[PDB]
Paper text:
Cell surface layers (S-layers) form symmetrical lattices on many bacterial and archaeal cells, playing essential roles such as facilitating cell adhesion, evading the immune system, and protecting against environmental stress. The S-layer is built from one or more (glyco)-protein subunits, S-layer proteins (SLPs), that self-assemble into a highly flexible and dynamic lattice through an entropy-driven process, allowing for structural adaptation in response to changing environmental conditions. In this study, we introduce the SymProFold pipeline, which utilizes the high accuracy of AlphaFold-Multimer predictions to derive symmetrical assemblies from protein sequences, specifically focusing on two-dimensional S-layer arrays and spherical viral capsids. The predicted models were validated using available experimental data at the cellular level, and additional crystal structures were obtained to confirm the symmetry and interfaces of several SymProFold assemblies.
High-resolution experimental data confirming the proposed assemblies at the atomic level is very scarce. Based on our predicted models of Viridibacillus arvi and Methanococcus voltae, we designed constructs (see Methods section) containing only the domain responsible for the formation of either the 4-fold or 2-fold axis. G Proposed assembly of Viridibacillus arvi (gray) with the 4-fold symmetry axis shown in orange. Aligning the crystal structures with the SymProFold models revealed a great similarity, with RMSD values of 0.65 Å for V. arvi and 1.38 Å for M. voltae, further confirming our predicted assemblies. For the assembly prediction of S-layers from B. brevis and V. arvi (Slp1), an additional region above the core, responsible for the self-assembly, is present. The domains and residues in this layer might be important for interaction with the environment, including the host.
Author numbering: 766 to 848
The structure:
Amino acid sequence: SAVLVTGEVSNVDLDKTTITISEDGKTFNYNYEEAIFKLHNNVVSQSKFESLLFGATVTASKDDKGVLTLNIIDEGVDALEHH
């Protein structure tokens, strides 16, 4: 499960299910539609994940089969709180 990046979520687009993750001045973009979602390594639903996603710290990783996992390390807030 190669790690792609660990860092802060920005630019959350819930409609397009896309995020940007930033680490060390670099930006990584993901469509999380088909991702496995975790919260402190606990598997969770998309909805739960999105509820804590804005400004979250997330690790993005991919197994040998190309399946994307997005794990919230440090909790963000929901779309409505973010405003």
